[PDB]
Amino acid sequence: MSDIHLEDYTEQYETGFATVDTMIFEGGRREELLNGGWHYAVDQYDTCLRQKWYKERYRDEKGFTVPIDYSFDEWPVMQLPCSWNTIDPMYLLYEGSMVFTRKFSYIAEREETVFLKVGAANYLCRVFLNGKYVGMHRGGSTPAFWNITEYLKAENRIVLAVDGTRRPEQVPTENTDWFNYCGVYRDIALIRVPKCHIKTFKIALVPDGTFGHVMAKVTLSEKITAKAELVIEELGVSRKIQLENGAGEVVFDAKPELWTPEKPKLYDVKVTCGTDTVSDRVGFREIRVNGRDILLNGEPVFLRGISCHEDSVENGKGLTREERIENIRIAKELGCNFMRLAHYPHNEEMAKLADELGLLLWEEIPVYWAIRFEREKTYEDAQNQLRELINRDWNRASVIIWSVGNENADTDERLKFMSVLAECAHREDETRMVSAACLVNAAKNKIEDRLMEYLDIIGINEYCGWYTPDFAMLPALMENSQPDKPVIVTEFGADALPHHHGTISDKGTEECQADVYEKQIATLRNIDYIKGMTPWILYDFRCPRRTSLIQKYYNRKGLLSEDKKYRKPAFYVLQKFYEELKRKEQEN
C-alpha cells in the first residue's frame, strides 16, 4: 500500500542526475534518434511514479493477474518531440505530468558506450529503461545526457515521465511572464561512442588583443594520458594536444579571419584521440570591454538589437529550423546586428544558425523575478543550468554575453546568489562578457544596483511611456546616472494588439506603441554610455498574465504579430533608426 500511503514518493528518484558533468560533446557525432510516435498517458496525479508502471508487474507471486491502471501498447500515440500544450486544445493549459513510452532494438557492432540525450524537457524528466530507473534532469531548457550502456538489452522499452509542474523553488519560479510549455520538446537521441571518448572540446581566439593566438581544451571520458590531434585545414593547423589523466590544453599561433555578423567566417575543425573523432564549425572573434566601450575584434560597437522568446503558434517552444531562420532573417531585415534570446536557453541550433548567418547573441538562464535566493538547492539548480548552457554553446562565436538573470530585487541574498553566478560564468568561460538585466532604482530614478559591480556589461530594463507612463522620467533617468561600464537597454516597449488602433495616448494601440518607440529612441540615441538596445520584443508570445480584451493571453509588445506575418508600425520606427546607424557606420 506504499503507492497510496507514501508521502514523499519523489525522494527515491533524486539520483542518477543528468548535469553539466554528464554532458558529452556532440560535434561531428552520428546519432540515432528516438523521435517519433510514443504511446502516452496524462498522469495528473503522478500515478506512474507511485505505482511504478515501468516495472510492468502484471501478475503476483502466486500467479494471479492483478489489476493495473495503464496499457502501454494500447495507449494513444503522440509525436515526440513537442510542447504537448500545442498538440491539442485539451492540453494547452495542462501542466501536470505525462508518461511516454516506446520500444527500440539495440545491436552493438563494436564495444561501445551509449548515451541517451533528451534535448530538453520542461521541467522534470525521469527516465526508465527496461524496468529500471536511470535518473532524472532538473531544468526545462537544457539537454540531458545519461549513460545507459549497462541498461540496454536486444529489445528495449523506454519510459519518460515528464512533469510540467511549476514550483516556487525551481528556476524559474512559478511566476514568469511567459507561457509554461511542457514536455519533451527537443530531439531525443541515442549516442554511441568509444568507452574512452572526447568529452569536452572548447576552442576560441585568445582575448589578448593580438588576434594571433587560439586556445583549445580537451577532456576524455577516462583519466588516461594520451595525445589528441587538432586539425584546422583551412588555417594550416595540425597540432597534437598532450592530455594527462584525461585533460589537456594547447595555445598555438594562428591568424584566422575574425568573425563578425557582416562577415560570419567559419572554419571546420577536427579533433582525434585514440579511435574517437569529434568535429566542429567555429568562428574566431574577440569580445572585450574597455571602460564604457564594447570591443568586438578591437573596434567599438553599438549593439543594434531585438529581444526574442522561443515561441510559436503551432509548435509552442519546440520551434523548427525554419522558424529560427525566420527569426534571424526578420531581425536583420529590422537592421539588427544583435539579439537577446530571453529568458532561458533556446535550442542550440539558434546559436549555430547565428554563427552561419551572422548575428551577435545574448543567452540567459531563467533566474527570473523572485527566485528563492536563500535556498541552497535552488542555487545548485541555477548553477547547473548556467554551466549546462555554457558548456553546450562554448564554441559559438555568435554568442558574446552570458546573462545570469533578469529583473531581480536588490536584496542581500539576491546579491550573494547572483554575484556568485556571475563569478561562476567567468570561471567557466574566460572569453565572454557576463551581464544581467537589472532594474532601475525606482526611488531615485537612477541606474543603481549592487549587482552591476560584478558584471562586465550593465543590462537595464525600463518602460518609460508605459509602466512608468511619464516620458519625462526617461531623460531624467539617463542624466541621474553616470555608469563606468557599457549599458545595454535590455528591454523597453509597449503593448500593441495587431490592427488595434487609436490615438497616441490610447495605451495598447499600435499608435501608442510607435509613439513610445519614437520618444525612447530620441533619448537613448544620444546617451554616451548606452552601447546597445534589445527592445521588448520581436514578436508577440503566449503569456498567462495578460487577460484583457486587447491582450488575449499574449504579450502584445511584439513588433510583429504572433505568427510573424504582420509588422506593426513600431517595427518601421526601429528599423529606420537602425538603418540610420547602418549607413552612418558605412559613411565612415
Ligand X SMILES: O=C(O)[C@H]1O[C@@H](Sc2ccccc2)[C@H](O)[C@@H](O)[C@@H]1O
Region 305-364 residues binding a second copy, contact defined as CB under 8 A: none
**4 counts as binding a second copy under rule CB under 8 A:** yes
**Site stretch for a second copy (CB under 8 A), options 199-207, 344-352, 444-452, 490-498:** 490-498
Alpha helix locations (H) across 403-496? 412-428, 473-479
CB neighbours (10 Å) of residue 297?
16
Identity of the residue, 295 or 543, whose beta carbon is nearer to ligand X in the bound complex: 543
Shorter beta-carbon distance to a second copy: residue 7 or 587 = 7
Minimum distance of ligand X from residue 175's CB (angstroms): 11
User: Which of ligand X, a second copy, none has residue 443 at its interface (CB below 5 to 8 Å by kind)?
Assistant: none
Site string for ligand X, 458-497 (x = CB under 6 A): ---x-x---x-----------------------x------
* CA torsion through residues 164, 165, 166, 169, sign: negative
Answer for which of 198, 389, 439, 447 binds ligand X (CB under 6 A) is 439
* Cβ at position 495, least distance to ligand X in Å: 8
Work out what residue 33 binds among a second copy, ligand X, none; the CB cut-off runs from 5 to 8 Å by kind: a second copy
Q: How many residues does the chain have?
A: 588
**Whether 81 contacts 119, CB under 8 Å:** yes
Of 97 and 403, which CB lies nearer to ligand X in the complex structure? 403
Binding mask of the shown chain, residues 166 to 185, with x at each position contacting ligand X by CB under 6 A: -----------x--------
Least distance from a second copy to the Cβ atom of residue 493, Å: 11
Judged by CB, which is closer to a second copy: 32, or 150?
Answer: 32
| 3-state secondary structure at position 586 | helix
| Helix (H), strand (E) at residue 571 | helix 569-586
Residues 81-140 that bind a second copy (CB under 8 A): 89-96, 99, 104-107
Cα separation, 287 vs 189, whole angstroms: 34
Cβ-based neighbour number of residue 538 at 10 Å: 26
What is the phi/psi pair of residue 309, to 5°?
-85, 160
442 binds, among a second copy, ligand X, none (CB under 5 to 8 A by kind): a second copy
Residues in the chain followed by a break, C to N above 2.5 angstroms: none
491 binds, among a second copy, ligand X, none (CB under 5 to 8 A by kind): ligand X
Q: How would you classify residue 400: left for phi > 0, otherwise alpha for psi between -120 and 50, otherwise beta?
A: alpha
Q: What share of the chain is helix, strand, coil (3-state, %, to 5)?
A: 20, 30, 45
User: Can residue 34 be called a binding residue for a second copy (CB under 8 A)?
Assistant: yes
How many residues touch a second copy (CB under 8 A)? 91
Q: Which neighbouring-strand residues pair with 192?
A: 114
- The DSSP letter of residue 321 is H
Q: Is 407 in the site for ligand X (CB under 6 A)?
A: yes
Choices 322-330, 396-404, 497-505, 528-536; region in contact with a second copy by CB under 8 A:
497-505
* Partner touching 43 among ligand X, a second copy, none, CB below 5 to 8 Å by kind: a second copy
Nearer to ligand X, 128 or 463 (CB): 463
Q: Any contact of residue 337 with ligand X (CB under 6 A)?
A: no
Grid coordinates belonging to 283: 568562428
Q: Which does 461 bind (CB under 5 to 8 A by kind): a second copy, ligand X, none?
A: ligand X
Q: Is 586 in the site for a second copy (CB under 8 A)?
A: no
How far is residue 559's CA from residue 415's CA, in Å, rounded to a whole number?
34
Q: 484, 437, 496, 444: which is closest to 462 by C-alpha? A: 437
Calpha distance 26→308 (Å, rounded): 26
Residue 555 CA to residue 541 CA, distance in Å, equals 5
- Name the residue nearer to a second copy (CB basis): 16 or 544: 544
Torsion of CA 277, 278, 281, 282, to 10 degrees: -110
Answer yes or no whether residue 290 interacts with a second copy by CB under 8 A.
no
CB of 134 to a second copy, least distance (A): 17
Q: Name which of ligand X, a second copy, none residue 536 binds, using a CB cut-off of 5 to 8 Å depending on partner kind.
A: ligand X
> Of 298 and 469, which has the nearer Cβ to a second copy?
469
**Residue nearer to a second copy on the CB measure, 156 or 297:** 156
47 binds a second copy (CB under 8 A): yes
* Beta-carbon contacts of residue 309 (< 8 Å; ≥ 6 apart): 178, 342, 343, 537, 538, 541
Quickly tell me which residue has 491502471 as its cell: 69
Per the DSSP assignment, residues forming a β-bridge with 117 are 145, 189
Interaction mask 511-550, ligand X, x per CB under 6 A: -------------------------x--------------
CA distance 29 to 270: 11
Binding site for ligand X (CB under 6 A): 177, 343, 406-407, 439, 461, 463, 467, 491, 536, 555, 557
